[PDB]
Amino acid sequence: NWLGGLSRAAFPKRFVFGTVTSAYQVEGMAASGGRGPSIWDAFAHTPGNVAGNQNGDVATDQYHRYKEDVNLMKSLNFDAYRFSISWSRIFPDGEGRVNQEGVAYYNNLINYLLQKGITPYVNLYHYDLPLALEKKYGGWLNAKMADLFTEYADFCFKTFGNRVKHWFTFNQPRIVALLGYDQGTNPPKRCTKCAAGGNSATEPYIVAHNFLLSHAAAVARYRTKYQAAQQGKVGIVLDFNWYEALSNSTEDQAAAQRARDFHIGWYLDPLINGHYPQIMQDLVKDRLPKFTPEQARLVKGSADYIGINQYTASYMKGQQLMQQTPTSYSADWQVTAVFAKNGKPIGPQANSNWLYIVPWGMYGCVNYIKQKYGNPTVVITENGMDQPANLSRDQYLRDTTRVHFYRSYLTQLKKAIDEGANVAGYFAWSLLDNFEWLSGYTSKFGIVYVDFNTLERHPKASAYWFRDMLKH
Numbered sequence: 510n511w512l513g514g515l516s517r518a519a520f521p522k523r524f525v526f527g528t529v530t531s532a533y534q535v536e537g538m539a540a541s542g543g544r545g546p547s548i549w550d551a552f553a554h555t556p557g558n559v560a561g562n563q564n565g566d567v568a569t570d571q572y573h574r575y576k577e578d579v580n581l582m583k584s585l586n587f588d589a590y591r592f593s594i595s596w597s598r599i600f601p602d603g604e605g606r607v608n609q610e611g612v613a614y615y616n617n618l619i620n621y622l623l624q625k626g627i628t629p630y631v632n633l634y635h636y637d638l639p640l641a642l643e644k645k646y647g648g649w650l651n652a653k654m655a656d657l658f659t660e661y662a663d664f665c666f667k668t669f670g671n672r673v674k675h676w677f678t679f680n681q682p683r684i685v686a687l688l689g690y691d692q693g694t695n696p697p698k699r700c701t702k703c704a705a706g707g708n709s710a711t712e713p714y715i716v717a718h719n720f721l722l723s724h725a726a727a728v729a730r731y732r733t734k735y736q737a738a739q740q741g742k743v744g745i746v747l748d749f750n751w752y753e754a755l756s757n758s759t760e761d762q763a764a765a766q767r768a769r770d771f772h773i774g775w776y777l778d779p780l781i782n783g784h785y786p787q788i789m790q791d792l793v794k795d796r797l798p799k800f801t802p803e804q805a806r807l808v809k810g811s812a813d814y815i816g817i818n819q820y821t822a823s824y825m826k827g828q829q830l831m832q833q834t835p836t837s838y839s840a841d842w843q844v845t846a847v848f849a850k851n852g853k854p855i856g857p858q859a860n861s862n863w864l865y866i867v868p869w870g871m872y873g874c875v876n877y878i879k880q881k882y883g884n885p886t887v888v889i890t891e892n893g894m895d896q897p898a899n900l901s902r903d904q905y906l907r908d909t910t911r912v913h914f915y916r917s918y919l920t921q922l923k924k925a926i927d928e929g930a931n932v933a934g935y936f937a938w939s940l941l942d943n944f945e946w947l948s949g950y951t952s953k954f955g956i957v958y959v960d961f962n963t964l965e966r967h968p969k970a971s972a973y974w975f976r977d978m979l980k981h
């Protein structure tokens with residue numbers, strides 16, 4: 510049938526199903542309600558940076574419409590909602606003065622979610638560093654971010670933690686490091702060539718290191734001050750796309766494993782084992798920061814669960830590892846991504862050029878984490894696909910490809926869980942069509958259609974698929 514034998518009975522007892530948004534992508538009221546600017550506000554308001562010079566000033570206006578959106582997610586039989594708190598909406602300058610109107614918004618949101626029986630899963634950070642912190646401290650280049658983030662996290666735990674029991678610190682630090690500091694295509698637009706300055710060979714590693722230290726510090730604060738009373742959990746969200754060896758050659762198998770290590774091992778080896786992957790230590794050498802023993806012990810075991818954002822897969826082709834002059838994090842891997850095997854593409858692309866529809870990548874990623882890292886508790890924190898711009902409403906609603914996407918990816922996830930993977934939940938990116946970073950409003954990831962002229966919500970076929978699949 511159209512569910513393909515999927516239902517709540519097909520997953521573990523108490524398995525959590527949710528949808529996901531992030532603050533800047535959906536909230537709107539970017540310069541209102543006392544919110545201070547983030548690095549994304551400054552970036553998106555610069556001509557040329559975003560498709561059509563668009564920005565998140567209004568976005569989906571969830572700020573005003575949150576009760577409509579919560580009613581909708583409940584009507585679709587979800588158990589949970591992953592959203593993020595905008596740091597600069599709480600602390601307009603990133604430190605010091607609290608914006609009480611901002612606090613009130615998140616209180617109202619959290620309270621309504623709970624009233625409607627939806628569990629809040631709350632991200633502290635989703636790319637939206639307060640602009641004041643970027644200017645004053647140099648953002649994630651500065652080790653002082655650990656202190657600054659911890660104080661912000663402390664406030665959130667104190668203010669919301671009696672109700673919020675499921676936290677995440679960061680979202681995809683790999684992408685911040687890569688796009689913000691290697692390629693320089695996301696704020697702060699740093700890179701070797703870039704006008705803002707930077708160094709693609711060193712800064713991504715500094716930034717990743719500071720994310721890990723900041724995460725660890727915030728979790729240490731949670732555990733020592735709040736956890737006894739609040740009895741919640743704190744994790745982190747990491748992107749992981751699957752890498753499959755192009756052939757069974759030694760070089761190609763090594764390349765696939767090297768890619769896994771530079772992609773997910775970069776964060777998981779510190780979080781699980783207390784060190785960076787050996788291959789990164791060997792290849793990146795002096796450009797890879799060293800944890801002190803005390804720091805490594807703070808970082809190891811500091812995630813109660815691992816959020817994995819899983820979208821896609823590629824093949825990897827290898828070659829002889831060679832001595833080379835350092836140029837970038839990306840070039841450090843010494844691999845070649847390949848998107849076809851035996852003359853056939855790995856999968857068709859969704860609207861985003863990077864997003865190949867490869868359901869077996871979900872199995873690959875989950876099974877790999879199970880086998881490599883001692884089967885830690887995993888939550889699939891994002892999974893989804895996008896439609897292009899300029900379709901009619903009815904074309905958006907008839908999202909047959911997305912229905913197929915979810916049925917196939919969830920079937921592969923089920924396969925991994927049935928084989929013993931410790932997966933505790935699954936969250937669809939996204940509840941709503943939203944502001945998709947560089948793509949602005951030209952990329953539509955929602956299971957619910959948003960008319961960006963009127964702001965009206967209309968559930969797509971995929972929303973009704975979930976409703977049918979998830980009926981209690």
Ligand SMILES: OC[C@H]1O[C@@H](O[C@H]2[C@H](O)[C@@H](O)[C@H](O[C@H]3[C@H](O)[C@@H](O)[C@H](O[C@H]4[C@H](O)[C@@H](O)[C@H](O)O[C@@H]4CO)O[C@@H]3CO)O[C@@H]2CO)[C@H](O)[C@@H](O)[C@@H]1O
Pocket residue numbers: 531680681684687748749750818820821823839842844845846863891938945946954
């Ligand atoms: O976009 C939807 C949603 O997803 C979350 O973030 C997305 C980013 O928006 C997107 O830019 C990012 O793109 C990745 C892509 O997934 C990777 O497959 C690719 O990986 C490279 C690797 O870096 C290379 O070194 C290697 O050689 O090749 C591989 C494969 O080509 O890199 C690109 C970036 O350049 O994907 C993210 C998810 O993975 C956000 O959380 C959410 O807010 C977004 O709305």
Ligand SMILES: [Zn+2]
Pocket residue numbers: 570573
């Ligand atoms: Zn409004």
